[PDB]
From Swiss-Prot:
It comes from Homo sapiens. Chromatin reader protein that recognizes and binds acetylated histones and plays a key role in transmission of epigenetic memory across cell divisions and transcription regulation. Remains associated with acetylated chromatin throughout the entire cell cycle and provides epigenetic memory for postmitotic G1 gene transcription by preserving acetylated chromatin status and maintaining high-order chromatin structure. During interphase, plays a key role in regulating the transcription of signal-inducible genes by associating with the P-TEFb complex and recruiting it to promoters. This is Bromodomain-containing protein 4. Interacts with p53/TP53; the interaction is direct. Interacts (via CTD region) with CDK9 and CCNT1, acting as an associated component of P-TEFb complex. Interacts with RELA (when acetylated at 'Lys-310'). Interacts (via NET domain) with NSD3, CHD4, BICRA and ATAD5. The interaction with BICRA bridges BRD4 to the GBAF complex. Interacts (via NET domain) with JMJD6 (via JmjC and N-terminal domains); the interaction is stronger in presence of ssRNA and recruits JMJD6 on distal enhancers. Interacts with NSD3. Interacts with NIPBL. It is found in: Nucleus; Chromosome.
């Protein structure tokens, strides 16, 4: 019923770096997806209380959202591009698992995922 704590965006024990690929993921990939007309459901964690989704955090055991990814990029949480790409892929997959094919939210996630794949196809070499 109650929401879990959000995914961590700060952890002094976790190793991290600034890389050209992580800068690309913030300034090109996230920038593009964040501004999209369909971004808004993905800009913060799923509020399963407000949305009356009492099963959401029973079905989705690795929550992720672009608000969390934005904070992780801006606050240098990540070691490499793969960690950040995995977060985006977890966000999309969660949406596809919880919802039905052709649901509005699934079509919105698919539109963001198409733009995501366009942009990571052109990920710079390290």
């Amino acid at each position: 019923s109650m929401n879990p704590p959000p995914p961590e965006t700060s952890n002094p024990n976790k190793p991290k770096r600034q890389t050209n690929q992580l800068q690309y993921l913030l300034r090109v990939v996230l920038k593009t997806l964040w501004k999209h007309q369909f971004a808004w459901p993905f800009q913060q964690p799923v509020d399963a209380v407000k949305l009356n989704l009492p099963d959401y955090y029973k079905i989705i055991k690795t929550p992720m959202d672009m608000g969390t990814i934005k904070k992780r990029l801006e606050n240098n949480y990540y070691w490499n591009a793969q960690e950040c790409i995995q977060d985006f892929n977890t966000m999309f997959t969660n949406c596809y698992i919880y919802n039905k094919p052709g649901d509005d939210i699934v079509l919105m996630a698919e539109a963001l995922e198409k733009l995501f794949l366009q942009k990571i196809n052109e990920l710079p070499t390290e």
